[PDB]
C-alpha cells in the first residue's frame with residue numbers, strides 16, 4: 001500500500017498509488033477495494049475522482065494516482081480504522097503533532113518529510129507527468145476584462161524561477177530557484193482559516209462550501225469603504241477598496257448589511273491581501289511567475305480571478321498569477337515520492 | 343485665522359496656529375476664544391491639548407500650534423457652524439469630496455493640497471521644530487523583552503531615507519528619499535477601519551476606545567490558531583500565529599470565545615499583517631527606518647509594541663519601528679504650511 005500524506009492544520013491530504021499491473025493478503029485487497037469502489041469515506045472523507053492520474057508509471061509499476069482528503073479533526077477516526085484492519089511517508093505540521101498517534105498502529109514506521117522538499121518535489125513531479133495529457137498549470141487570460149477573461153493552459157517545462165504561494169490555514173510563500181535551491185521567503189497568518197473563521201463568526205455558515213455560496217450572492221461594497229467613498233470619485237480608481245469592512249464602523253450600515261455581503265467582503269479582503277503580499281514577495285525575489293496552491297482556492301473561482309486581476313493590474317502585466325489543478329495535494333504527493341529513500 | 347485641514351475617510355484633523363504676539367473683528371476674536379477656552383467642541387470635537395506646540399515662530403509670528411480632531415461624519419455640522427459666524431488649506435480625500443460644501447461659505451477659497459506633499463512636509467517640519475524641546479520621534483528599546491522594553495527618544499536630524507507607514511482607514515506606504523524625492527510605494531486596505539469595522543461587528547463595541555479597552559482584557563489565542571496547534575510545538579516558535587481567527591472554524595470554540603478575545607484577535611490580526619507588509623516594503627525599498635503615522639495607533643500601546651516587536655524579530659534587528667507624538671496630524675500641518683504659496 002503506497003501512501004503519501006500531508007497532514008495540515010485543517011485538512012489531511014492523501015495520495016494513493018493503485019497498481020493496475022497486478023495471491024496477496026485479504027485485508028490488503030479489502031483496503032484497495034474500499035478506496036477504489038467508494039468516493040465518500042465515512043461522513044467526511046472524499047476522493048477527488050476528477051483529479052485522478054491514470055496509467056502513471058511509478059517506481060517501475062503501472063498504476064493510478066488517487067487524491068483523497070478529510071478533516072484533520074477526523075484523523076483519530078482514520079487511525080482507529082487503521083488499528084482494526086506499512087511504511088508511511090508524511091509531511092505537514094501534523095506529521096510531528098500526531099507522530100505518536102500513528103505509532104499506535106503496530107510496527108507502522110512513520111517517516112516525517114520536510115514540508116518544503118515535499119511540496120516542491122510533488123509540484124515538479126505532477127507538472128512533468130502532466131494531467132493525463134493536459135496541462136497541470138493554467139492562468140486566466142485577459143484577467144482584467146470579464147468579457148475576455150478565460151482559463152487557459154500554461155507551460156512550466158522550465159519552472160525556474162518560481163514563487164509558490166501556499167494558501168492553507170495561513171499563508172506560506174516559497175521561492176524556487178532551481179532543483180535543489182529553494183527557500184521559504186515569508187508568510188502571513190491571514191489565509192483560508194481567516195476567511196473561514198471570520199465568515200463563520202459573521203454569517204453563521206458551517207462549511208467552506210456554504211461560505212463560498214453565500215459570498216457568490218453578496219455585495220462586498222456594502223461592507224467595504226471604497227476610494228470614491230473617501231474622495232467622492234477617482235492612481236487609484238474609485239471602485240478600489242480603501243478600507244476593508246471600513247463601512248461597518250457605522251452602526252446603521254452594520255444593521256442593513258446581509259450575511260452574503262459579509263461573506264463576500266471576508267473573501268475579497270482575505271484574497272486581495274494575499275495578492276498584495278504575493279506581489280510584494282515577487283518584486284523582492286525578482287520572480288514574475290507566481291503560482292498559488294493550497295485548498296483555499298478549491299471550487300473558488302472568485303478568489304482565483306481576484307488574484308489574477310490583482311497581480312495583472314498592479315504589475316502592469318509583469319506578474320502572472322498561475323494556478324494548478326492539483327493545488328491542494330502536492331505535499332501528499334512529494335511525501336509519496338520520498339518512499340524509495342527508505 | 344490660520345488653519346490646515348486633513349479631511350480623511352474617518353477623521354478630520356485640524357491644525358490651528360494661534361498668535362500670541364498680538365482692534366480686530368468681533369467674530370474673529372470669538373473663534374479664537376472658542377478654540378482656546380474649550381477642549382471639547384460640540385459632542386464630538388476634541389482638542390489634543392498635550393500635543394500643543396508653544397511659542398512656535400511661524401510665518402514671522404510667534405504663536406501656539408493647536409491640534410484638533412472630529413469625525414468626518416460631523417463635517418456638515420462644522421460647515422453649518424461656519425456659515426453662521428478666509429483661505430483654507432486642505433488635503434486628504436475629503437478635500438475633493440467636500441470641495442463644493444466648503445464653498446457654501448461665502449467667498450471662502452479652498453486650496454486642495456497633495457496629500458503626499460502635506461504629510462512629508464508636515465512630518466519634517468514638526469521634527470525639525472521639536473516637541474517643545476523634546477523628541478517628536480521615539481522607538482521601543484529592547485522591543486522583544488517585556489521587562490526591558492521601554493519608550494525612548496529617537497533622532498531624525500537626517501531623516502533620509504524613510505519609510506512612512508500611514509495607518510488610517512486603510513494603509514498607505516511612502517518612501518522618502520530626500521527633500522523633493524518621495525513616492526507612494528503601495529498600500530493595503532486592511533487598516534484601522536478594518537480593525538474598527540470588524541471589531542464592531544464581532545463585539546458590538548461602539549467606539550475605537552471601547553474596542554481597545556475590550557482588547558486589553560482578552561486572549562487572542564482563543565480565536566487564533568497557533569504554530570503549536572498545528573505542529574504540537576515549535577524557524578517559527580509555537581506561540582506564533584499560524585492562522586488568524588483560524589480556531590473560529592470550530593463551532594465549539596466560536597461558542598466559548600468572549601468579546602474581549604475577539605477584540606484582541608482583531609487587533610493582533612490587523613497589526614501583525616501591517617507589520618509584515620511594512621517589513622516587505624522596507625526590504626523592497628532598502629530602507630531600515632520605518633515610521634508609523636495615522637490614528638490607528640493613538641492611545642494604542644498594544645499595537646505599537648506589536649509592530650516594534652515584529653519588525654525587530656523578523657528583521658533580526660535591521661529594521662527599526664519608529665513612532666511620532668503627532669502621528670495623526672502631519673497632513674493637517676503640511677497643509678497649513680502651504681499657506682504662504684497662496
Ligand SMILES: Nc1ncnc2c1ncn2[C@@H]1O[C@H](COP(=O)(O)OP(=O)(O)NP(=O)(O)O)[C@@H](O)[C@H]1O
Pocket residue numbers: 007008009010011012092093167168169170191192193194195196208293294295296297298328572584
Ligand atoms: N472541505 C473544506 N473544509 C475546510 N476547509 C476547506 C475545505 N475546502 C477548502 N477549504 C479551504 O482550504 C483551506 C485549507 O487548505 P489546506 O492547504 O488543506 O490547509 P492545511 O494544509 O490544512 N493548513 P496548514 O497546516 O496551514 O498548511 C481552508 O482554510 C479553507 O479555507
Ligand SMILES: Nc1ncnc2c1ncn2[C@@H]1O[C@H](COP(=O)(O)OP(=O)(O)NP(=O)(O)O)[C@@H](O)[C@H]1O
Pocket residue numbers: 230242349350351352353354434435509510511512533534535536537538550635636637638639640670
Ligand atoms: N476617536 C476615534 N474615532 C474613530 N477612529 C479612531 C479614533 N481614534 C483612533 N481611531 C483609529 O484611527 C483610524 C483613523 O485614522 P486616520 O489617520 O485619522 O484615518 P483617516 O485620515 O480618517 N482615513 P484615510 O482617508 O484613509 O487617510 C480609525 O480607523 C481608527 O482605527
Ligand SMILES: [Mg+2]
Pocket residue numbers: 006007008009092168
Ligand atoms: Mg498545508
Ligand SMILES: [Mg+2]
Pocket residue numbers: 348349350351434510
Ligand atoms: Mg488620513
